[PDB]
From a paper:
The analysis of the X-ray crystal structures of [name] at low and high pH and with different heme ligands show the existence of a large resemblance in the overall fold, which is also similar to the spatial arrangement found in other NPs. These structures reveal the extensive clustering of Lys side-chains at the protein surface opposite the heme pocket, which is implicated in the charge-stabilized head-to-tail interaction observed in the crystal lattice. However, packing effects also explain the large structural similarity observed for the different ligand-bound and unbound structures, although such a structural similarity does not permit to rationalize the effect of deletion of the N-terminal residues on the binding affinities of certain ligands nor the pH sensitivity of [name].
Here we report on seven crystal structures of [name] at low and high pH and with different heme ligands. The overall fold of [name] resembles that of other NPs. Eight anti-parallel β-strands (A to H) form a barrel that hosts the heme cofactor including the ligation by the proximal His60 residue. One of the most interesting features of [name] is its ability to bind to negatively charged membranes.
Residue numbers in the entry: 1 to 185
Amino acid sequence: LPGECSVNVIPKKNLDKAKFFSGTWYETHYLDMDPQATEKFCFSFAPRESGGTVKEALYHFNVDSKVSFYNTGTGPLESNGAKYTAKFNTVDKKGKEIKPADEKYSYTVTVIEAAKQSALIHICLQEDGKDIGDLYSVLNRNKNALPNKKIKKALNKVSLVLTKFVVTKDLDCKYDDKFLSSWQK
Ligand code: HEM
């Protein structure tokens, strides 16, 4: 049911960490597993890893309200090298903290597949370690690009097809690319 995080979310075997945890990723397609979650959003992020800790900068844009928000997330990478659980705060466009982390919230990202300039991730949001909801996202290095077929193969294993996803390339997305490109610089 909506609210419980999906089963059969499998971390990629032997994800190349240096490649995945670099640069900027754009969401091109997403599927919130709650069918009533129909707000249109654009998303991009810059995840980095060092010494088994992930530090990432996040960017969301609400298409309807035209309001953006910025977060950073930090947490340990699992031994499998393709899954992490983060605590997060809220920052402004200059990276200054404007709201501190709320200890009760966390999220868990699984990198399911990565191929060429494409990837497939899943996020499970939690409150006090209990599932509150989840979403799948197809990522690309290029905003307007279609995913590698390996991403579709991965979707098919969890009984999903790409046509079910929201596509954002036609939406009025506005991005802060400098916030992400300047991450940790
Ligand atoms: C890829 C498609 C994604 C979409 C469409 C999306 C959409 C959203 C929406 C609608 C909200 C709630 C905003 C509000 O309450 O007004 C939100 C919040 C949030 N998302 Fe995402 N999200 C995506 C991916 C991600 C990913 C991959 C992460 C983590 C790596 C993430 C981390 C967060 C966090 C931490 C919040 C809470 C921000 C806050 O409360 O200040 N999101 N997202």
